[PDB]
Design an enzyme around this catalytic site. Structure first.
Site, PDB file in Angstrom:
ATOM      1  N   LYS A   1       0.760  -1.226   0.000  1.00 31.34           N
ATOM      2  CA  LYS A   1       0.000   0.000   0.000  1.00 31.34           C
ATOM      3  C   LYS A   1       0.791   1.275   0.000  1.00 31.34           C
ATOM      4  O   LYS A   1       0.302   2.291  -0.484  1.00 31.34           O
ATOM      5  CB  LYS A   1      -1.005   0.042   1.123  1.00 31.34           C
TER       6      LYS A   1
ATOM      7  N   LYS B   1      -6.884  -6.517  -1.883  1.00 27.16           N
ATOM      8  CA  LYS B   1      -6.741  -7.762  -2.683  1.00 27.16           C
ATOM      9  C   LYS B   1      -5.498  -8.521  -2.226  1.00 27.16           C
ATOM     10  O   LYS B   1      -5.530  -9.693  -2.036  1.00 27.16           O
ATOM     11  CB  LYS B   1      -7.102  -7.707  -4.202  1.00 27.16           C
TER      12      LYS B   1
ATOM     13  N   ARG C   1       2.528 -24.251 -33.444  1.00 28.56           N
ATOM     14  CA  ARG C   1       3.860 -23.651 -33.619  1.00 28.56           C
ATOM     15  C   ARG C   1       4.543 -24.017 -34.956  1.00 28.56           C
ATOM     16  O   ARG C   1       4.173 -25.006 -35.601  1.00 28.56           O
ATOM     17  CB  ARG C   1       4.743 -23.970 -32.436  1.00 28.56           C
TER      18      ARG C   1
ATOM     19  N   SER D   1      12.643 -14.581 -33.731  1.00 20.48           N
ATOM     20  CA  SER D   1      13.370 -15.606 -33.019  1.00 20.48           C
ATOM     21  C   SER D   1      13.923 -16.587 -34.026  1.00 20.48           C
ATOM     22  O   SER D   1      14.836 -17.332 -33.692  1.00 20.48           O
ATOM     23  CB  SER D   1      12.422 -16.277 -32.132  1.00 20.48           C
TER      24      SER D   1
ATOM     25  N   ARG E   1      17.263 -15.583 -34.566  1.00 14.48           N
ATOM     26  CA  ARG E   1      17.978 -15.721 -33.294  1.00 14.48           C
ATOM     27  C   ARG E   1      18.241 -17.160 -32.829  1.00 14.48           C
ATOM     28  O   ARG E   1      18.761 -17.334 -31.724  1.00 14.48           O
ATOM     29  CB  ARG E   1      17.223 -15.043 -32.179  1.00 14.48           C
TER      30      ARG E   1
ATOM     31  N   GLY F   1       6.348 -18.797 -34.157  1.00 13.47           N
ATOM     32  CA  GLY F   1       4.909 -18.588 -34.251  1.00 13.47           C
ATOM     33  C   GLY F   1       4.440 -18.168 -35.614  1.00 13.47           C
ATOM     34  O   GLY F   1       3.347 -18.512 -36.017  1.00 13.47           O
TER      35      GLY F   1
ATOM     36  N   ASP G   1       8.134 -13.651 -40.302  1.00 10.08           N
ATOM     37  CA  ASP G   1       8.271 -12.216 -40.550  1.00 10.08           C
ATOM     38  C   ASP G   1       9.365 -11.831 -41.536  1.00 10.08           C
ATOM     39  O   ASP G   1      10.533 -11.746 -41.167  1.00 10.08           O
ATOM     40  CB  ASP G   1       8.642 -11.562 -39.224  1.00 10.08           C
TER      41      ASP G   1
END
Ligand SMILES: [K+]
Ligand SMILES: [K+]
Length: 327
Positions: A52, A64, A141, A172, A175, A181, A184
DNA sequence: CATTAGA
DNA sequence: TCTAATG
């Protein structure tokens, strides 16, 4: 990183919710700086109160934190997790082209499932249709071994069309990454840079090529500088057809390739980190250029880059193979 | 954080 | 034009 873990996770759970299920941009934005700040904090939060004292940490959240600390759960979280609507929203969202705004709408109309959306293809736009069409494949994938087969095809047509092109598959993939995924591809051409008033064809020719040979199979969106599609490896001599894959090609003024490439090659950290350093080194780096810093506070004036090296040289650093640009 | 769709 | 959705 692990001492404030549950708190940060609970909190993001919470944020993510307001933003999607609700339209509480604010609360949403709230839970985020909090989770952010509790995250930096070097000690174990032992109570709300303690928390807090932090910035962003108000009474709503601290409360919470106590409940969570107190018991290993949180009702609100328990409630939302149960919640069929919200559940519904979270799911629709996996469909490509379905953001929250549409998710809510659909839900409202009562389209809560995959099956629902089928029956209702009509309420969906092209992007959404496609995404639906390929819900499974899109979620799967891309194994590098495949990434190598796609990259191979891509560079080949690119070259056939015009030998003047320069393409690079970033991410990646670049890399090392065992799988990725989506693909690009950063594109450029000497005949297009900052000023040289475009050549929308430059993007077009290429896509057209890839299409012509069945590499591309659908178009999500195609503009004069950014094409966003779906591709498929030639289904062999049968018994094994390939999954539908997302691809993105984007044109770039040759005079900004390498930074673009740099950048897009990541990783998110290696980037931020190399970037932070150019600051000391008396520079500025961003997705398009690299300018020298000027004492007055800031400065301008793009230095000339012919390769990922030039940028390196400039900040007088060690050339880093993409492989180890991990951080 | 800028580019595309679409209404 | 605005607004959503991607990356
Ligand atoms: K406070
Ligand atoms: K989506």
């Amino acid at each position: 990183e692990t001492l404030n873990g549950g708190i940060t996770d609970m909190l993001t759970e919470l944020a993510n919710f307001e933003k999607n299920v609700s339209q509480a941009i604010h609360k949403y934005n709230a839970y985020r700086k909090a989770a952010s700040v509790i995250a930096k904090y070097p000690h174990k939060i032992k109570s709300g109160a303690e928390a807090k004292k932090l910035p962003g940490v108000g009474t709503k959240i601290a409360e919470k934190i106590d409940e969570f600390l107190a018991t290993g759960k949180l009702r609100k979280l328990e409630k939302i997790r149960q919640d069929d609507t919200s559940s519904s929203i979270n799911f629709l969202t996996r469909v490509s082209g379905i953001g929250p705004s549409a998710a809510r709408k659909f839900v409202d109309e009562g389209i809560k499932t995959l099956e629902d959306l089928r029956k209702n293809e009509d309420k969906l736009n092209h992007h959404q249709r496609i995404g639906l069409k390929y819900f499974g494949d899109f979620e799967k994938r891309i194994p590098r071994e495949e990434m190598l087969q796609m990259q191979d095809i891509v560079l080949n047509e690119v070259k056939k069309v015009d030998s003047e092109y320069i393409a690079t598959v970033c991410g990646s993939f670049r890399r090392g990454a065992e799988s990725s995924g989506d693909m690009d591809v950063l594109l450029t051409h000497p005949s297009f840079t900052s000023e040289s008033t475009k050549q929308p064809k430059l993007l077009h020719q290429v896509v057209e090529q890839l299409q012509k040979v069945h590499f591309i199979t659908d178009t999500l969106s195609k503009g004069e500088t950014k094409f966003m599609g779906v591709c498929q490896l030639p289904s062999k001599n049968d018994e094994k057809e390939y999954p539908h894959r997302r691809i993105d090609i984007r044109l770039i003024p040759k005079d900004q390739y390498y930074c673009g490439v740099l950048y897009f090659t990541g990783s998110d950290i290696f980037n931020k980190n190399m970037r932070a350093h150019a600051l000391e080194k008396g520079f500025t780096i961003n997705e398009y250029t690299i300018r020298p810093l000027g004492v007055t506070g800031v400065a301008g004036e793009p230095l000339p880059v012919d390769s990922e090296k030039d940028i390196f040289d400039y900040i007088q650093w060690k050339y880093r193979e993409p492989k180890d640009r991990s951080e």
